[PDB]
Amino acid sequence: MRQLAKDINAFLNEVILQAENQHEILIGHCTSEVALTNTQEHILMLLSEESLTNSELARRLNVSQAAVTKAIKSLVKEGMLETSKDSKDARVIFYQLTDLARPIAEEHHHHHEHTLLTYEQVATQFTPNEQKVIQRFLTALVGEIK
Amino acid sequence: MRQLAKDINAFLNEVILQAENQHEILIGHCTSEVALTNTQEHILMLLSEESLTNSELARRLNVSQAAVTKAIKSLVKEGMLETFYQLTDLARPIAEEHHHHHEHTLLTYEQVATQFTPNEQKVIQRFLTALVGEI
Ligand SMILES: [Zn+2]
Ligand SMILES: [Zn+2]
Ligand SMILES: [Zn+2]
Ligand SMILES: [Zn+2]
């Protein structure tokens, strides 16, 4: 058996461990001045863009409506979200960010960018030809996992 | 930005999705005729090998002691474990199935690796190590 087979198993183990039960991996520490859960921040990021329903948020976040419901209630309660109505949105009423939430959504967005840039750093340690090999590997691996 | 950077992010999300709550990914269906969580099966597998404290199990799976303990209490309630904790006869085929599932998983990764040359495999190895190093 090739060493790589064992490396793949250990790698997947490490990924899951690093995910810390969150629905996503982000590189480095959150820098927000208000401590919201990762899921809460991600919601603020998404809603800073799309005015989604709690049901649509749950599908994207891959969680239960209940969890989203709890997240939203907390966000409304903590003054991160408020109800609103305006000509730019078809919805009769939706949750939009308050001024307090703006920097949070922005920070979480920056955190996603930093995460992608980190993978960019990793990718560029390899030649374009080598990157292609790594691409083929991820495709074959993900094909067996799903 | 290199597309590979985005592919990496997409891949990690898929792994996390596939590992729903579990501490590990396994390939294919669990063929146990019993509806235990993956963590429960894994704990049975380990205890089928040797007696371990809940603290030790937690270090083995890299999960909280709370996670291990809850799994154990359920296993006891389902008649899989008894007082260290030791397997009952009901649990034995399950621990065996979970071990076979692991073997099948490694064999699948072997099949993946052998789609690449020895030199290509090294590249992929360096990649895995570099990626984890940054996480
Ligand atoms: Zn943050
Ligand atoms: Zn996020
Ligand atoms: Zn199983
Ligand atoms: Zn296992």
Side-chain angles (χ1 to χ4, degrees), chain B residues 46-47 49-53 84-86:
Chain B
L46 296 189
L47 295 186
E49 299 176 1
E50 56 174 339
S51 292
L52 297 164
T53 69
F84 302 100
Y85 292 98
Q86 66 196 41

PDB file of all heavy atoms in Angstrom, chain B residues 46-47 49-53 84-86:
ATOM      1  N   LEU B  46     -12.548   0.379  18.972  1.00  0.00           N
ATOM      2  CA  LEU B  46     -11.382   0.589  19.820  1.00  0.00           C
ATOM      3  C   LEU B  46     -11.442  -0.261  21.089  1.00  0.00           C
ATOM      4  O   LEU B  46     -10.452  -0.873  21.481  1.00  0.00           O
ATOM      5  CB  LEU B  46     -11.219   2.070  20.170  1.00  0.00           C
ATOM      6  CG  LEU B  46     -10.928   3.028  19.008  1.00  0.00           C
ATOM      7  CD1 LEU B  46     -10.582   4.416  19.528  1.00  0.00           C
ATOM      8  CD2 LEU B  46      -9.812   2.493  18.126  1.00  0.00           C
ATOM      9  N   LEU B  47     -12.604  -0.303  21.728  1.00  0.00           N
ATOM     10  CA  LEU B  47     -12.747  -1.089  22.945  1.00  0.00           C
ATOM     11  C   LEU B  47     -12.681  -2.586  22.650  1.00  0.00           C
ATOM     12  O   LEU B  47     -12.346  -3.380  23.527  1.00  0.00           O
ATOM     13  CB  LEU B  47     -14.036  -0.726  23.685  1.00  0.00           C
ATOM     14  CG  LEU B  47     -14.056   0.709  24.208  1.00  0.00           C
ATOM     15  CD1 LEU B  47     -15.287   0.957  25.062  1.00  0.00           C
ATOM     16  CD2 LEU B  47     -12.786   0.995  25.000  1.00  0.00           C
ATOM     17  N   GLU B  49     -10.525  -3.740  20.886  1.00  0.00           N
ATOM     18  CA  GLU B  49      -9.090  -3.971  20.802  1.00  0.00           C
ATOM     19  C   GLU B  49      -8.469  -3.953  22.191  1.00  0.00           C
ATOM     20  O   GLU B  49      -7.699  -4.840  22.549  1.00  0.00           O
ATOM     21  CB  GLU B  49      -8.432  -2.919  19.911  1.00  0.00           C
ATOM     22  CG  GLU B  49      -8.931  -2.931  18.477  1.00  0.00           C
ATOM     23  CD  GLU B  49      -8.331  -1.818  17.643  1.00  0.00           C
ATOM     24  OE1 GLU B  49      -7.503  -1.050  18.178  1.00  0.00           O
ATOM     25  OE2 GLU B  49      -8.693  -1.710  16.452  1.00  0.00           O
ATOM     26  N   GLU B  50      -8.817  -2.939  22.976  1.00  0.00           N
ATOM     27  CA  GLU B  50      -8.305  -2.842  24.336  1.00  0.00           C
ATOM     28  C   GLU B  50      -9.162  -1.923  25.192  1.00  0.00           C
ATOM     29  O   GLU B  50      -9.898  -1.085  24.678  1.00  0.00           O
ATOM     30  CB  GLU B  50      -6.857  -2.356  24.332  1.00  0.00           C
ATOM     31  CG  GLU B  50      -6.653  -1.033  23.628  1.00  0.00           C
ATOM     32  CD  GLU B  50      -5.231  -0.521  23.765  1.00  0.00           C
ATOM     33  OE1 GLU B  50      -4.526  -0.963  24.696  1.00  0.00           O
ATOM     34  OE2 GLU B  50      -4.820   0.324  22.940  1.00  0.00           O
ATOM     35  N   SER B  51      -9.064  -2.094  26.505  1.00  0.00           N
ATOM     36  CA  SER B  51      -9.794  -1.253  27.438  1.00  0.00           C
ATOM     37  C   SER B  51      -9.147   0.123  27.540  1.00  0.00           C
ATOM     38  O   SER B  51      -7.936   0.244  27.724  1.00  0.00           O
ATOM     39  CB  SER B  51      -9.873  -1.918  28.812  1.00  0.00           C
ATOM     40  OG  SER B  51     -10.692  -3.073  28.759  1.00  0.00           O
ATOM     41  N   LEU B  52      -9.965   1.159  27.410  1.00  0.00           N
ATOM     42  CA  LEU B  52      -9.477   2.529  27.429  1.00  0.00           C
ATOM     43  C   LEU B  52     -10.427   3.398  28.237  1.00  0.00           C
ATOM     44  O   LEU B  52     -11.641   3.204  28.192  1.00  0.00           O
ATOM     45  CB  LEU B  52      -9.368   3.068  25.998  1.00  0.00           C
ATOM     46  CG  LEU B  52      -8.375   2.354  25.076  1.00  0.00           C
ATOM     47  CD1 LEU B  52      -8.628   2.703  23.617  1.00  0.00           C
ATOM     48  CD2 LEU B  52      -6.941   2.679  25.470  1.00  0.00           C
ATOM     49  N   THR B  53      -9.875   4.353  28.977  1.00  0.00           N
ATOM     50  CA  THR B  53     -10.694   5.301  29.717  1.00  0.00           C
ATOM     51  C   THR B  53     -11.356   6.255  28.735  1.00  0.00           C
ATOM     52  O   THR B  53     -10.958   6.338  27.573  1.00  0.00           O
ATOM     53  CB  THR B  53      -9.854   6.124  30.699  1.00  0.00           C
ATOM     54  OG1 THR B  53      -9.001   7.011  29.965  1.00  0.00           O
ATOM     55  CG2 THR B  53      -9.005   5.208  31.573  1.00  0.00           C
ATOM     56  N   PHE B  84     -13.289  -0.401  33.730  1.00  0.00           N
ATOM     57  CA  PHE B  84     -13.405  -0.065  32.313  1.00  0.00           C
ATOM     58  C   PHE B  84     -14.741  -0.520  31.736  1.00  0.00           C
ATOM     59  O   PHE B  84     -15.498  -1.239  32.388  1.00  0.00           O
ATOM     60  CB  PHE B  84     -12.282  -0.722  31.508  1.00  0.00           C
ATOM     61  CG  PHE B  84     -10.902  -0.339  31.955  1.00  0.00           C
ATOM     62  CD1 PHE B  84     -10.162  -1.187  32.765  1.00  0.00           C
ATOM     63  CD2 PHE B  84     -10.333   0.857  31.547  1.00  0.00           C
ATOM     64  CE1 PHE B  84      -8.886  -0.842  33.170  1.00  0.00           C
ATOM     65  CE2 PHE B  84      -9.057   1.207  31.949  1.00  0.00           C
ATOM     66  CZ  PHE B  84      -8.333   0.357  32.761  1.00  0.00           C
ATOM     67  N   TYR B  85     -15.019  -0.099  30.505  1.00  0.00           N
ATOM     68  CA  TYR B  85     -16.163  -0.604  29.755  1.00  0.00           C
ATOM     69  C   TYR B  85     -15.694  -1.698  28.809  1.00  0.00           C
ATOM     70  O   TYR B  85     -14.600  -1.611  28.253  1.00  0.00           O
ATOM     71  CB  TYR B  85     -16.833   0.515  28.956  1.00  0.00           C
ATOM     72  CG  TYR B  85     -17.524   1.548  29.811  1.00  0.00           C
ATOM     73  CD1 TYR B  85     -16.901   2.750  30.123  1.00  0.00           C
ATOM     74  CD2 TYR B  85     -18.799   1.322  30.310  1.00  0.00           C
ATOM     75  CE1 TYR B  85     -17.530   3.696  30.908  1.00  0.00           C
ATOM     76  CE2 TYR B  85     -19.435   2.261  31.095  1.00  0.00           C
ATOM     77  CZ  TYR B  85     -18.798   3.446  31.391  1.00  0.00           C
ATOM     78  OH  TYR B  85     -19.429   4.382  32.176  1.00  0.00           O
ATOM     79  N   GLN B  86     -16.519  -2.727  28.633  1.00  0.00           N
ATOM     80  CA  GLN B  86     -16.196  -3.828  27.731  1.00  0.00           C
ATOM     81  C   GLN B  86     -17.390  -4.189  26.850  1.00  0.00           C
ATOM     82  O   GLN B  86     -18.543  -3.954  27.216  1.00  0.00           O
ATOM     83  CB  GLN B  86     -15.702  -5.050  28.514  1.00  0.00           C
ATOM     84  CG  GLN B  86     -16.743  -5.700  29.415  1.00  0.00           C
ATOM     85  CD  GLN B  86     -16.121  -6.647  30.437  1.00  0.00           C
ATOM     86  OE1 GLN B  86     -15.078  -6.351  31.022  1.00  0.00           O
ATOM     87  NE2 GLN B  86     -16.760  -7.791  30.650  1.00  0.00           N
TER      88      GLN B  86
END
